[PDB]
Design a protein around this ligand. Structure first.
Ligand code: CE4
Length: 261
């Protein structure tokens, strides 16, 4: 195994948990994988697929992102800091996508899922763009239970990195849609301690975090260094104890190890 894989394996061993990494370097389209074909609970990193699926819908329904969506008291689930500010009012699908992506808003994700016809509508878009691995099975908040061995609401690092590349750097989405997703990811507020923390601060990053049961702590990112082609990096992490604490430091250190090599 490679030098970078030995360092990631050592980071994993020091952490007590299970680490999954996929890097795509688009300069030479080379890859670094660590447990790259293992399934991991996506938690909120699945919100990228849901937001992109609604963006795909907007390529035919041109005004879709401006459509108001009612926020009812019954719709509110925990960890919905934006949607809770609009109960008994409305948010547009663009505002709900930005809330889901940039504040990890769970109610906002549920509105995206409903716009897509349920969790099967999110999986549907994954399959449409060639991702045979992603599966969304539940709504918020239960999709983050992150139970060991449970295949629901999982993907592999290899699949998610390839999908994130297609959605942002590729053209799985239309031109305005692709640029909109990139802007949303670049404006994420929840990732300062995760992949971003392990990379040189001159680099531009768009990312989406996730967290859940079993101390599951995730981040998926597109990375624009100055002077070289972009990178796609997925870092998934999960732990043996159901009540384990989040470990965003592991994602930061994984990104740092990757950036070194
Ligand atoms: C900032 C947050 C927290 S709310 C969101 C969501 N996670 C949960 O609601 C969750 N469910 O637990 C069963 C959770 C959050 S913290 C913990 N120990 N568990 C998600 O991942 O979509 N995501 C992020 C994030 O890190 O991006």
């Amino acid at each position: 195994t490679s030098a970078v894989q030995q360092k990631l394996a050592a980071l994993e061993k020091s952490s007590g948990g299970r680490l999954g990494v996929a890097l795509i370097d688009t300069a030479d389209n080379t890859q670094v994988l660590y447990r790259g074909d293992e399934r991991f609970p996506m938690c909120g990193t699945s919100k990228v697929m849901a937001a992109a699926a609604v963006l795909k819908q907007s390529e035919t329904q041109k005004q879709l992102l401006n459509q108001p969506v009612e926020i009812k008291p019954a719709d509110l689930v925990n960890y919905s800091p934006i949607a809770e500010k609009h109960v008994n009012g409305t948010m547009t699908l663009a505002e709900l996508s930005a809330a889901a992506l940039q504040y990890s808003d769970n109610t906002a994700m549920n509105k995206l899922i409903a716009q897509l016809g349920g969790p099967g509508g999110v999986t549907a878009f994954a399959r449409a763009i060639g991702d045979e691995t992603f599966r969304l099975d539940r709504t918020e908040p239960t999709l983050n239970t992150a139970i060991p061995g449970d295949p629901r609401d999982t993907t592999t690092p290899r699949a998610m990195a390839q999908t994130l590349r297609q959605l942002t750097l590729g053209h799985a989405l239309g031109e305005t849609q692709r640029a909109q997703l990139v802007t949303w990811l670049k404006g994420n507020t929840t990732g300062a301690a995760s992949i971003r923390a392990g990379l040189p601060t001159s680099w531009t990053v768009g990312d989406k975090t996730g967290s859940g049961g079993y101390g599951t702590t995730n981040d998926i990112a597109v990375i624009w260094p100055q002077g070289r082609a972009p990178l796609v990096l997925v870092t998934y992490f999960t732990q043996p104890q159901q009540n384990a604490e989040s470990r965003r430091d592991v994602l930061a250190s994984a990104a740092r190890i990757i950036a070194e090599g």
